[PDB]
Write a protein that binds this ligand. Structure first.
Ligand code: ZN
Length: 215
């Protein structure tokens, strides 16, 4: 159920009634779109302001609702890049304090810094848990859990099946990354789907894979 756009740059595919994956090329990058009864919520926006705008615009039109909220899963350019777009449209950009301080330190506008280690948000009907499992791909990476769907957005912490290595480890803690992955496996013992930061949606298996990439 791939609804692409004008250019193939942006693309969304349904995971269920209310959860879609968004993917933009910048190397393809995933996030979620949550159709809740109070607006659209993005897990992660995009590479930059341009693609973040195109994304918001494409979902607002399709779903007939405003993007009200974004969850930023770490402060790297590809995740925080459209932050200026979010703040200036009045889109709440949720992040941990650490993601925000990293965003600030890298010259970006700051997201809210409102997420704790475990934070439980509700958007209309939609329950979203954010989970900081520890350092991994970055020091600040969080996962997002949709407890009504048992869906985990692992973000960059989680490598797709097709990832044969760890990608960008310049900011990674390859020693803590295994434990952080394990922390996810323990918190979420029954996962229906996992969305890696890049690549094709999988299950629990993507976390086992990522563990293996770390040996
Ligand atoms: Zn990253």
């Amino acid at each position: 159920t791939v609804i692409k756009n004008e250019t193939g740059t942006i693309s969304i595919s349904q995971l269920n009634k209310n959860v879609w994956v968004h993917t933009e090329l910048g190397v393809p990058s995933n996030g979620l779109v949550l159709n809740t009864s109070k607006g659209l919520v993005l897990v992660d926006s995009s590479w930059d302001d341009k693609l973040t705008k195109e994304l918001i615009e494409m979902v607002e039109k399709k779903f007939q609702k405003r993007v009200t909220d974004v969850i930023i899963t770490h402060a790297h350019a590809d995740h925080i890049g459209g932050i200026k777009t979010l703040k200036e449209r009045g889109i709440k950009a949720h992040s941990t304090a650490l993601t925000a301080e990293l965003a600030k330190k890298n010259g970006y506008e700051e997201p809210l810094g409102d997420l704790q280690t475990v934070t439980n948000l509700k958007f209309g009907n939609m329950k979203v848990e954010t989970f900081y499992p520890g350092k991994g791909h970055t020091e600040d990476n969080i996962v997002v859990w949709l407890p009504q769907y048992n869906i985990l957005v692992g973000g960059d912490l989680v490598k797709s099946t097709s990832a044969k290595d760890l990608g960008n480890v310049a900011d990674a803690y390859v020693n803590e990354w295994s434990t952080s992955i394990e922390n996810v496996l323990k918190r979420y013992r029954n996962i229906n789907a996992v969305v890696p930061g890049h690549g094709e949606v999988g299950d629990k298996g993507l976390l086992l894979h990522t563990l293996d990439l770390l040996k």
